[PDB]
Amino acid sequence: PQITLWQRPLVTIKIGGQLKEALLDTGADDTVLEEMSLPGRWKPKMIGGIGGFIKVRQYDQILIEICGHKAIGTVLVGPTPVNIIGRNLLTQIGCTLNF
Amino acid sequence: PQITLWQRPLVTIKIGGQLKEALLDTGADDTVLEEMSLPGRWKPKMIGGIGGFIKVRQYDQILIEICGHKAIGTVLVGPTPVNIIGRNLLTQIGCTLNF
Numbered sequence: 001p002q003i004t005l006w007q008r009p010l011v012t013i014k015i016g017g018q019l020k021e022a023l024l025d026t027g028a029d030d031t032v033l034e035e036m037s038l039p040g041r042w043k044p045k046m047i048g049g050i051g052g053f054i055k056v057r058q059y060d061q062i063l064i065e066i067c068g069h070k071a072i073g074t075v076l077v078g079p080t081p082v083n084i085i086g087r088n089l090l091t092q093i094g095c096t097l098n099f
Numbered sequence: 100p101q102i103t104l105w106q107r108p109l110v111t112i113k114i115g116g117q118l119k120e121a122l123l124d125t126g127a128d129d130t131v132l133e134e135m136s137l138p139g140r141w142k143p144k145m146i147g148g149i150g151g152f153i154k155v156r157q158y159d160q161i162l163i164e165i166c167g168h169k170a171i172g173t174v175l176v177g178p179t180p181v182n183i184i185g186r187n188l189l190t191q192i193g194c195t196l197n198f
Contacts, residue, residue, distance in 0.1 A: 005186040027124030087104040
């Protein structure tokens with residue numbers, strides 16, 4: 001698509017059959033999604049936040065489908081206030097910033 | 100330009116004669132720049148961070164020049180670990196996310 005930033009660039013993502021909406025954040029290196037159950041084998045990971053570090057669970061190789069584009073990458077699942085699609089997956093779908 | 104996100108999208112900004120480099124962050128609603136002296140009249144503003152809220156100074160109407168494009172917007176100046184160009188100025192330069 002072409003997305004303008006006059007409003008927060010939220011998009012619908014499909015992961016786990018579950019359908020969520022997330023922020024395309026060129027400033028986030030990682031994807032952090034709200035707590036959901038992903039079939040997998042996870043490894044612990046601490047990520048920073050306002051107020052402190054929270055622990056999240058790291059799932060590698062998850063397939064996710066951002067604005068209809070299949071993408072394989074790691075997602076971190078955890079008590080995040082907002083679902084973020086960071087650069088590790090913006091890459092795969094071919095995002096660019098253009099002006 | 101067309102910027103890909105295989106690496107953090109840093110760019111050089113000119114503000115105050117001072118030349119800095121900042122992150123184009125579609126996930127940041129505001130611009131927060133490292134402490135510098137901007138001629139102006141400022142109003143206080145608290146912004147959140149890892150560990151807590153920090154106080155910053157809000158300058159409205161500042162001219163800034165992102166990847167050679169003049170833009171007028173508010174910048175917050177403050178002890179931020181990183182210079183962020185958020186959506187309030189990505190708009191003016193005509194940024195879009197494209198895939």
